[PDB]
Design a protein around this ligand. Structure first.
Ligand code: NDP
Length: 417
């Protein structure tokens, strides 16, 4: 049923087919450099002891310490962790961070655990994987069903074990502001998406002031993308959507009022002055920027032709299928690859790690400007590769990331060819 690691390896081979890479380097990149599977025992609230399965996969560390989150899902598998670590490698390589690829996970349903049990689980996971993590070895991060509270617990346990012999704040990112946290973490993904959209408009020669944007999904990423677009880029937000449905208004939407209505009516539907539309119908609107910030695979071969957006900002994690990719490219529409558009979160986590390591913490403006520089440089590199190699933007981003990792490997002497 299309194993995640098989899919990742196929993606890597496809990317290697568009660039000059040696066979030994490809074989090295097809396998994670270190996989750690540990037992995570905790004491239940009823006094019993339960053992959970924890993972920590470090795909590659040629460019520096590995970076990646920890998932707490009942359906976690070592294959999924390996695939996500492989993808995290390219995610940190495309935006030029001194990081490798890493990922963790515990096979547990956190909906049935109390606060004390969750804290015990985090501390036991740290005790189990201490020997393969560190400020300069492996930096975990929040992921699905994991939050900054668990980050604080993990950091505290790591500091307790390490005996405060170094920057224990920098061992993990996504921490609360009170303990080594960073500013701008809430709006990192949306800010990166906005910078990439601005650069794409600059590349296409389109002035965004007075244009239209449609956003699918109105969670944290979608709402902040719409709000930041309207604020900075001056783009008129004409359509937003949630799981229940979507709304449309050619005169424009106010993101704050829409958020208030969603937080009051439980959904964005039936917003005053707005016409109710379906998600599929939102994908059909004639806009200049489309930002899918929702479930995977919303653009398929069926509806790829009927898309009228000039720029498709893949804020979510792969909302466009390869057939849809080819169809959309044929229509002369610029796509911003998913792991380049939403690279703001990992970039801001890197900024947090830098602040923790240095012992000096920045402000909201400094973080915003550094993120702006990083996203602009990454998008311009990807677009230049796209224009030079006459390939898809996703293929160009993969080529850039794999080339950076391959050059780092060659410089270390790991591969001689
Ligand atoms: N936000 C972040 O920090 C980062 C985000 N990403 C990626 O970004 C996207 C969104 O992130 P995030 O804000 O955390 O997500 P959220 O869980 O906070 O919100 C999800 C939003 O998308 C909607 N949604 C879920 N399924 C559908 C669907 N089938 N159709 C239409 N709308 C749907 C939800 O609707 P409803 O409210 O009704 O449930 C909600 O509006 C994801 O694809 C994620 O992978 C990854 C990098 C970090």
């Amino acid at each position: 049923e299309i194993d995640p690691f098989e899919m990742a390896v196929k993606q890597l081979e496809r990317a290697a087919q568009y660039m000059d890479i040696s066979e030994e380097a490809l074989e090295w990149l097809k396998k994670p450099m270190r996989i750690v599977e540990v037992s995570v025992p905790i004491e239940m609230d009823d006094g019993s002891v339960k053992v959970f399965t924890g993972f920590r996969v470090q795909h590659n560390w040629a460019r520096g310490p590995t970076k990646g989150g920890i998932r707490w899902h009942p359906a976690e598998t070592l294959s999924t962790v390996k695939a996500l670590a492989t993808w995290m490698t390219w995610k940190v390589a495309v935006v030029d961070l001194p990081y490798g690829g890493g990922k963790g996970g515990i096979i547990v349903n956190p909906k049935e655990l109390s606060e004390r049990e969750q804290e015990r689980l985090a501390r036991a996971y740290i005790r189990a994987v201490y020997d393969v993590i560190g400020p300069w070895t492996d930096i975990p991060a929040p992921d699905v069903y994991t939050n900054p509270k668990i980050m604080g617990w993990m950091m505290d346990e790591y500091e307790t074990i390490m005996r405060r012999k170094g920057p224990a704040f920098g061992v993990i990112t996504g921490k609360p502001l009170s303990i080594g946290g960073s500013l701008g973490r809430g709006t990192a993904t949306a800010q990166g998406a906005i910078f990439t959209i601005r650069e794409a408009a600059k590349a296409l020669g389109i002035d965004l002031k007075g244009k239209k944007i449609a956003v699918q999904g109105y969670g944290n990423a979608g709402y902040y993308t719409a709000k930041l677009a309207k604020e900075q880029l001056g783009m008129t937000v004409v359509a937003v959507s949630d799981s229940r449905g979507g709304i449309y208004n050619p005169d424009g939407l106010d993101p704050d009022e829409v958020l208030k209505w969603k937080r009051e009516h439980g959904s964005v539907k039936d917003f005053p002055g707005a016409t109710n539309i379906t998600n599929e119908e939102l994908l059909e609107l004639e806009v200049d920027v489309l930002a899918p910030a929702a479930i995977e695979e919303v653009i398929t071969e069926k509806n790829a032709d009927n898309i009228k957006a000039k720029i498709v900002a893949e804020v979510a994690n792969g909302p466009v299928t390869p057939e849809a990719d080819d169809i959309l490219r044929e229509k002369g529409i610029l796509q911003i690859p998913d792991f380049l558009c939403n690279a703001g979160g990992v970039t801001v986590s890197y900024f947090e790690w830098v602040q923790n390591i240095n012992g000096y913490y920045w402000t909201e403006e400094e973080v915003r400007e550094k993120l702006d520089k990083k996203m602009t440089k990454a998008f311009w590199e990807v677009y230049n590769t796209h224009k030079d190699k006459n390939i898809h933007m996703r293929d160009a981003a993969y080529v850039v990331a794999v080339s950076r990792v391959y050059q780092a490997m060659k410089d270390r002497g790991w591969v001689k060819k």
